[PDB]
């Protein structure tokens, strides 16, 4: 029963990467992967690993509780338990919980960035990744942000250094951004599914894993605030208008998916089944049983287009009245990687520097294939330390 | 029996245009009489001869499904806030206009944006444009601008005319303005459906506005200059990578529209309610405290409402709605029209009166629509911006009559 | 009686602090600061002391409120029954959704104040009040119109009435525009304050005092004294335009408060934690700023059993923003209030908090004013700190004049 399937999966995923690729730095990819599996192995298993995991996340669980009280003020009782007594799970509103947090996380990080807390963490961790793997400063810094900040909140930092940056790290930022899980996606889980430490685990894995699959084939006046209030205010506004963009995209995509599902019925096999039939070997290789590869394959297919939420909902529907396939599908669900986030990031980076946005559209979905395979690698890794 | 009263209407409507036209002698007849025939032909087509309503029913159920595919996205972003329970809890007010309409603007906007890059739009406009140019003698520029505005969402709307706008004649410049006001974007169209407006009438009101748009456009200011050849023009590349950026760019822009519409509604609805608090007050001493802006417009537009074919017994209402359409905007008219439509039936209206108004209210032709046109064309053709603003009122009248002509034909037929 | 010496003490302090922080305590003109103060206290007794005025102010609450009622008709149509009575029975106290019941009035008033601009109703009133101060206070016409302009008017129209006089203005004229802008408030925010549950009539008098009080401490710091010397298509487009701009503000305001509220809750989680090692695990920023502004809370004439509370609210405004202070002030006006404050206290606080004078306003003024006059962008950041004080003194001055003329309770 000792897993060879795990190492088999890692062998295949890295092989496909080479097949899809070549002359890459081996000291970069072997080290990045080493860091990925080691960090994940230690924080999950060996002592002081999970003990720390609970302390630096229960603090975050309080940060989320602060955001709740912030929403409680603005939206009143709609975010109370009165909805659940009438509509129940239908009383759960997506736009009142998933979107408004973007505002807070944007403003809060704008404060941390103004002080130097974010720069500190990014400069230290960034210097670590560029020393152990011999990578450029830009990508190593951007990855560090994606651990703490979301995906759309990362280019806000690595903007000026991202000007003349090569396409090598460009794919790295976008692949890391999609694989990233903090702020707006960490959001969802804690307030609906409530896995407290899954927030930290998937986040810390996202950046180095992202810098791994991406590095497979890697190698005029403005104004700024004076005080902290300006930063907290400006960040909120930026996070607000971004939230309007996010929520609009999500409604549209889910709606178009309902359309592509309707056109297939016309032309009784749903698209969710087609995705579950096609991407079934990917689950078989990852370690998921063949008996549950048809269902989890759909969620993977839903992970391709739809956000991780609808796939998570259908997952919990299977949970409500195996442990290996559950966690394997859980960490696979963790990550903001989807066809939606690509478009949002492309629009965000287009606002940063459209002069390079022309050739910065060639990668596109390749970043999703990188961020997903990176996070899926992190999921298969979690199956090794169950 | 008596279809003459409608033909009387058609005569007056077309007459008024000539009375206001710049030069009657310069009016081409093979152009206007043709488009007029196409409009009424399409009328008897989609209504009288059975097969027209069937193909209409196809698009009805189709769009209805497309709309239903949208709701699954809405019910996700806002949860089940709008359900059968919601109607039970909050009663009649349970129908949240903000959350049951504006999301469709985001959806259809993201739909048309996708169907545009694929070429599905570029193809349809090309065929229909090549038709109206071969029939009415008009050039390619207008015919594409007349065929497009039936289907296509706003703000990717100009790109068809974009290279032509900066150097076209007054009529061609006026024909686009008359079309833009006579037309109705698919985004707001879906909004009407959610309000309870009959979809089959919205679709039928659309395909009529294109020939009806060119009708009063060419009838007011005729073409006298040259139909510029294609080889003589020199365009500029736009600078929409793929389907990913298509649905996104179309959704986010549809959101900025949905938010913009909402504030405009909340404004006008509240401001009109304030004017009625002033009119009612001033008019109260004279013995009519119940007097309002709706009643005055109804009392004012009472005659015109009768000419199109509506009975006088229902003119006191018809004038208000059409009155509100022109002086306020398009939404406010329908919002105070669905009240007469639902089974509450404070006053029941005939199928003909309910239909003629469904077509009469279809159009952006309102005094508050000029700033959108001029504000949009100025960004493209800043040299003509002075000419576009001069033909402001003239265009609102044209687009209005175009919606009236489309209505008379609807009320005319009884099948 | 027998406040009156204690209030006059408070006023004299506010004037004293102005003379100290002034760049030149000798260039101050008597006819200006004495006149601007005289008008301020005069308008105070006018709407508070004489019964004939409380009738005017009472009339200037029914009218304004009736405008708010017309707005709610637009909100009820937009959201349906979400804000109706049914929501109260289900969610109780939480039924009052601050997002759907208050912000929509930021949208409506932003349109109305844009409809009255295309008509010329505003150009009429501004020209009147502006001309009056131009003759009496002797100020150059620019800041007089501006000072008169701000009271009613929403932002991004308000810069469009001073635009021609920005660059050509002096150090004083510039300081008077930014001082008044911080002294008074707009209609976009005033409308929300009523929906919040704040006494309207106090906000009216407060707004009318911010103009003379603004130019009082503005000119009480600057000399000037080197010789200053000298689009919508229709109504429908005017309304729709004002609605969209109001809508982009509402999203900005509501989103800023969500952040600001959640952050304060986070600060108390840290300071509460720090205090945990000190011994006081329940340490919050309210009491800290309470104790900090507690001395100042006594200068204006607040009881010692309430000066500790007012200081926490006055402090909350300055270091963050007024809109947050009003959110924790209405909890003391409820009929089930654990503590119902003194009838004189409830008035003074209202006049104190009414104003855009805080840190978050600086960054907005420096930026927006640089968009029009980019050359002076360096001078605004220099006077950005002094203007907030000059703007605060205006509101704190009106708070004393208010508390002084408290002869009757409201609501
Ligand atoms: C805003 C405050 C305002 C408008 C300024 C102030 O109102 C004005 O006050 C004067 C003086 O009190 C009133 O007119 C006259 O009153 C006295 C008569 O000798 C005299 O002292 C004044 O010199 C003389 O002008 C008027 O109220 C007004 O000029 C609020 O103004 C409101 O305007 C409304 C008009 O739309 C009116 O509202 C009221 O009218 C209804 C009956 O007409 C009343 O039932 C109801 O209370 C109220 O809605 C009214 O003129 C006034 O309140």
GROMACS .gro file of C-alpha atoms and ligand atoms in nm, chain B residues 285, chain C residues 52 56 59-60 62-63 66, ligand 1:
model
   61
  671UNK     CA    1  -5.521   7.514  -0.509
  853UNK     CA    2  -3.884   8.285   1.483
  857UNK     CA    3  -3.731   7.865   0.981
  860UNK     CA    4  -3.920   7.458   0.796
  861UNK     CA    5  -3.566   7.383   0.678
  863UNK     CA    6  -3.951   6.940   0.659
  864UNK     CA    7  -3.852   7.063   0.313
  867UNK     CA    8  -3.942   6.576   0.194
 1213LIG     C1    9  -3.573   7.617   0.369
 1213LIG     C2   10  -3.638   7.720   0.464
 1213LIG     C3   11  -3.757   7.791   0.395
 1213LIG     C4   12  -3.718   7.833   0.252
 1213LIG     C5   13  -3.620   7.952   0.256
 1213LIG     C6   14  -3.796   7.914   0.478
 1213LIG     O1   15  -3.931   7.950   0.451
 1213LIG     C7   16  -3.961   8.088   0.430
 1213LIG     O2   17  -3.993   8.150   0.555
 1213LIG     C8   18  -4.080   8.262   0.545
 1213LIG     C9   19  -4.088   8.333   0.681
 1213LIG     O3   20  -4.118   8.238   0.783
 1213LIG    C10   21  -4.222   8.217   0.503
 1213LIG     O4   22  -4.289   8.324   0.436
 1213LIG    C11   23  -4.335   8.438   0.510
 1213LIG     O5   24  -4.346   8.406   0.650
 1213LIG    C12   25  -4.374   8.519   0.733
 1213LIG    C13   26  -4.505   8.586   0.686
 1213LIG     O6   27  -4.512   8.719   0.738
 1213LIG    C14   28  -4.260   8.623   0.728
 1213LIG     O7   29  -4.186   8.618   0.851
 1213LIG    C15   30  -4.163   8.600   0.610
 1213LIG     O8   31  -4.090   8.720   0.583
 1213LIG    C16   32  -4.241   8.558   0.484
 1213LIG     O9   33  -4.149   8.524   0.380
 1213LIG    C17   34  -4.212   8.096   0.408
 1213LIG    O10   35  -4.220   7.975   0.483
 1213LIG    C18   36  -4.078   8.102   0.332
 1213LIG    O11   37  -4.068   8.226   0.262
 1213LIG    C19   38  -3.875   7.693   0.389
 1213LIG    O12   39  -3.977   7.746   0.304
 1213LIG    C20   40  -4.096   7.668   0.285
 1213LIG    O13   41  -4.133   7.672   0.146
 1213LIG    C21   42  -4.246   7.591   0.113
 1213LIG    C22   43  -4.293   7.626  -0.030
 1213LIG    O14   44  -4.285   7.510  -0.113
 1213LIG    C23   45  -4.365   7.610   0.211
 1213LIG    O15   46  -4.378   7.493   0.292
 1213LIG    C24   47  -4.491   7.483   0.378
 1213LIG    O16   48  -4.612   7.501   0.301
 1213LIG    C25   49  -4.734   7.434   0.338
 1213LIG    C26   50  -4.854   7.523   0.298
 1213LIG    O17   51  -4.819   7.603   0.185
 1213LIG    C27   52  -4.741   7.403   0.489
 1213LIG    O18   53  -4.858   7.327   0.516
 1213LIG    C28   54  -4.616   7.325   0.537
 1213LIG    O19   55  -4.587   7.362   0.672
 1213LIG    C29   56  -4.489   7.346   0.451
 1213LIG    O20   57  -4.479   7.242   0.354
 1213LIG    C30   58  -4.345   7.733   0.301
 1213LIG    O21   59  -4.348   7.852   0.222
 1213LIG    C31   60  -4.209   7.724   0.375
 1213LIG    O22   61  -4.223   7.640   0.490
   0.00000   0.00000   0.00000
